[PDB]
């Protein structure tokens, strides 16, 4: 039988969000120029310029 | 961040007896350290200083 006593609930939930997928589009990336650019040891990848 | 290939072509094309076009960069990056050993030259030096 129906019973509306055990029937009545309150659902409980957030009133908004914004979910986001690409985490990493929040994030600017840029490089130096490649004439700079170091290695592990701090020194340049290339060295012979 | 200066390439010093282009001093070595010159110096060799100056030279007027070698054809730079069938010298690869190594070998003219080579000249470069075996230049770059050698004492300048009095007046030059002086110049510069």
């Given at each position: 039988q129906f019973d509306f006593r055990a029937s009545m609930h309150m659902l409980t939930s957030n009133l908004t969000f914004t979910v986001y997928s690409?985490?990493?589009?929040?994030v600017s990336a840029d490089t130096v120029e490649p004439i700079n650019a170091v290695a592990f040891d701090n020194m340049r990848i290339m060295n012979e310029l | 961040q200066k390439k010093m290939k282009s001093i070595v072509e010159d110096f060799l094309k100056r030279?007027?007896?070698?054809?730079?076009?069938?010298?690869?960069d190594d070998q003219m990056y080579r000249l470069r350290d075996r230049l770059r050993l050698l004492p300048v030259e009095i007046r030059r030096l002086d110049i510069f200083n």
């Open positions: 690409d985490l990493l589009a929040f | 030279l007027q007896i070698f054809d730079i076009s069938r010298v690869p």
